[PDB]
Symmetry: D3
Amino acid sequence: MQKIGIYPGTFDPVTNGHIDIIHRSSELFEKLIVAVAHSSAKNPMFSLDERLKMIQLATKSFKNVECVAFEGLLANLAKEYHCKVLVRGLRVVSDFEYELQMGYANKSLNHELETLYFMPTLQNAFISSSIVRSIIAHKGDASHLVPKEIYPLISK
Amino acid sequence: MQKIGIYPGTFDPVTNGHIDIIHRSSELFEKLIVAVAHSSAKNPMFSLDERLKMIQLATKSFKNVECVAFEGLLANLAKEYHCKVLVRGLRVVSDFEYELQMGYANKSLNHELETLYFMPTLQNAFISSSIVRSIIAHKGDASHLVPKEIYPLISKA
Amino acid sequence: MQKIGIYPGTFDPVTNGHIDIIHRSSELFEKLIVAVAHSSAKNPMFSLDERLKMIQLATKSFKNVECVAFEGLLANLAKEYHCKVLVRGLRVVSDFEYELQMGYANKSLNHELETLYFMPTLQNAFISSSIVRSIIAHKGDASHLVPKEIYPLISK
Amino acid sequence: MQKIGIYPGTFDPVTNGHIDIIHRSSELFEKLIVAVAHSSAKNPMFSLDERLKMIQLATKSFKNVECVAFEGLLANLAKEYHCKVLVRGLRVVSDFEYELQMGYANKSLNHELETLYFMPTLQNAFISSSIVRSIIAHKGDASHLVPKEIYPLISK
Amino acid sequence: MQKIGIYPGTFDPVTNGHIDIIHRSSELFEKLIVAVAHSSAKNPMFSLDERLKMIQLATKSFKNVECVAFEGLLANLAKEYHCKVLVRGLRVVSDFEYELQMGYANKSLNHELETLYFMPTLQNAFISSSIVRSIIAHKGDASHLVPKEIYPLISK
Amino acid sequence: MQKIGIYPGTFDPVTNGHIDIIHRSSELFEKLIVAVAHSSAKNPMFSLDERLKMIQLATKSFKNVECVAFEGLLANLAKEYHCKVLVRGLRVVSDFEYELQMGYANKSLNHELETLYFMPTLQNAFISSSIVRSIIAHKGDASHLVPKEIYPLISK
Ligand SMILES: Nc1ncnc2c1ncn2[C@@H]1O[C@H](COP(=O)(O)OP(=O)(O)OP(=O)(O)O)[C@@H](O)[C@H]1O
Ligand SMILES: Nc1ncnc2c1ncn2[C@@H]1O[C@H](COP(=O)(O)OP(=O)(O)OP(=O)(O)O)[C@@H](O)[C@H]1O
Ligand SMILES: Nc1ncnc2c1ncn2[C@@H]1O[C@H](COP(=O)(O)OP(=O)(O)OP(=O)(O)O)[C@@H](O)[C@H]1O
């Protein structure tokens, strides 16, 4: 519990919300793994490596963090990791019941694996990766919405 | 505020619920711009151009309504028209928090951009575009759910 | 409909979120009636007299805003002023389906009467009267949550 | 009314949640029709004919249950079977107002057709087809999530 | 499961909802028991005996419906009636997760007792007893919201 | 940080869910303070003296858990214990947005104070103190929903 947390997502792209979660979650663990899924199902906008490199670039000055990709069931990724704690974010627009369902379905697959929920700062309470995508797609100013370390590649 | 409101949505297709919001909200501004967003992210059942035609036909009777299509960001649209107030509809099946969220995003992209929410008549309170789509795709009769002026166009696949 | 809108409430007490709704709504109507409800069943923390004085102090700066104490059904208040628009606040914690219900209930009693919903600003999105009352009850600092003019009165 | 109910679904695949609704609903009507929709717009993991086969196998022990495969409008299907009751399952992640919406719509398309809601057992309240699908696609144990009768045809 | 259903509630007062539901559910069981709970702890506006009288007057035309007033545990009342089905209405403002919670609580107190959910007609989907009470408290007109055979008893 | 977490509430009464959260949360902090709040304006079924005793009895086995009665601002308690983490539980029946609003309100009164959320086990996912109170008040058996150490006191 008090050792190795995993924070999974698509990180498409990473936002200031994701970064608050990584921050707070960071304080609480020894190693924290940022687990960038592939999420072929959800239509990805940025390539897994673009995404993984963006997080990598945003997560660098967090001395506890490591970022990585993966494909299969999150529950097993945690097994491989001798990880009993999933970190998830909660926000105004979260589908709360779906989150709870995922936490139990993860528990059901790996009887050792708990989920823990953190919230972003009030300023980031309404940021979703989805609105950020549209802002980027229609060419808006997303600069107060994502970490500056990624301005370069969001523009390419 | 009195001068210009914009009512933006996907309108896929426009529904009697939408028309209630347009009716009521038009009364409140000198001009109402109804703005049909391309919305590529969802895979709209109807084309951008079909949706614009549909809503033009449906809104002809409202003297101070103008329908455009935009593939811009809504903030630029607003700027273009010196518009400070967006209009949005609320219905029983709305995703209320997602609508609040859009409302704050729209403000922060355009600092004088506020959103105002209307509700349709009770008869149309359970109508969404999404349930009209399903009825239509399954060859059901949706003519009670949509203005009669678009019924020719919905009839084509 | 442009002539006159009514924003009813308990205003127990008036908060910065309520002031945002007054400000924006007063910009859209020739007059804005702020109607202060008895709210008997609620057993408010502050008396009617206190609540009405706080509304008047907070709203001095808005030249076209008037205050009135009232009792009971929104629909009849609205016919008394020949008003077709009720203004309502929407927030993260709003019970939205109940808002919709009230709006229909009110149009039933009075067929001309529409309900129109404003939001507060982001920094007030999480502010409720109720939370404000805990802070004052527990003798915390509520000064960043309520208008400055009210502040002397709100302190017991 | 009691002479006949229909329980429509994609059943992709049938899960222990579905079997609870079928069991309980079959207890209330003389006949229950379990109606497996092609649901071509979805992109079902299993073909219509496998889904149909699997739910037939899973329901043979319920003597008053009959399965059929259909394509188009359910409200019309129901008229063909002289059905006045559509059976729906509620579970923890249901979109509740959407369920009500669907009920009212189906009633506007067929004025005899009411919707009635059952719930699964507590154990199955958190079970979604979607989740069973992911697990199945990977190397996951779904044997506790779907009826034994079908767990063979799953990896076929 | 066919012979007898119970439809519990406070019925304070009975609305054109308690009634669409009585109508619909009474078509499914040989006998429908309408159980008026004393509900002491909600301080109902109308007394138990008044609510009972209202609901009897309003359900006289339904030949297989019987009304009873009670106050213990509803699960134990169900047992006394050899009842395996609790009937509940869902409406736009229902707290859905609370209804599911209740259905599971009762199931755990009486292992034969399931909960089944109906909806009222669309026109009544917004009707709430509390909205009827508030209209009444404030001398409004509630006559289009409650069945006509109770209108004498409520104007009083 | 990790040194100290606080789990506040009414605990009216402590339930199996609360206990699941204490279990899990106590494994992330050296010390966990269960902070018993005074239920102001909340219809408290059990006395403060009862609630504190039930939770001490029930948490005797967890060695790093201390239980205290607090009659002040929560954010302030946290300051007094030099605590930057509030532990909270998430359930199926939670008011999700209200919980978030509370997280944010506490941050604004104490800028160091973060909120972390746990789920209980699946079996307890639908349990709340509210449904336990109602079952106890109606004289039903709540022995499966509350820890065995507090049964004596409940019947007080
Ligand atoms: N603004 C935010 N603040 C805090 N947490 C967030 C925020 N947005 C998302 N999260 C959470 O962080 C985790 C990872 O989410 P992910 O990277 O998949 O993006 P997303 O925001 O869910 O969007 P999408 O699924 O559309 O890509 C989830 O637990 C999610 O709820
Ligand atoms: N675990 C469950 N328990 C009870 N009812 C369920 C469960 N899962 C689905 N249902 C309900 O049973 C019926 C059939 O649903 P359907 O077959 O369309 O699958 P689904 O679970 O909605 O998944 P998908 O759309 O991913 O294929 C619907 O009434 C549905 O809501
Ligand atoms: N508008 C409605 N339409 C259909 N069913 C309803 C409606 N309101 C309540 N019900 C159902 O009727 C039953 C009786 O509910 P009850 O008499 O407790 O009234 P209520 O509407 O919950 O009001 P209150 O709890 O404020 O007294 C409940 O089991 C509920 O499932």
